[PDB]
Symmetry: C2
Subunit: 77 residues, 2 copies
């Protein structure tokens, strides 16, 4: 249970997403940006893709070079 | 992919035929069930495996529905 020592993980990750909404972000970037944002190393060591995709309005996919990319879904109106 | 050699082929097929409208995990599992005649090997972290398949996209919807697709 890593939610005990890092309870705000949800809003912190959504925050990084929101900051990267335009172009999307990789995993290693999510981590470095998490460190920059909170002063603490990204706590999640297992199943990060699953964690990312537990968050609504998120899409993921790979570039041709094999980078797994996450981004917010465009709004529909 | 290791123990199950043809898993790649089978999941690629389930995608090709049944994912045209997007496909959830459990749909992949029941489709695999109706395909190979046996329960889908993976339980946890299927999203990771799916994403390792070329030309596949994942999405968590506004309402929290996890759906997989082929790009175009």
């Amino acid at each position: 249970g890593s939610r005990e020592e890092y309870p705000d993980i949800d809003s912190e990750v959504r925050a990084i997403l929101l900051s990267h909404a335009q172009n999307g972000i990789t995993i290693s970037s999510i981590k470095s940006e998490y460190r920059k944002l909170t002063g603490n190393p990204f706590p999640l060591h297992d199943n990060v893709t699953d964690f990312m995709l537990t968050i609504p309005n998120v899409t993921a996919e790979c570039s041709e070079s094999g980078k797994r990319i996450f981004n917010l879904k465009a709004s529909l109106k």
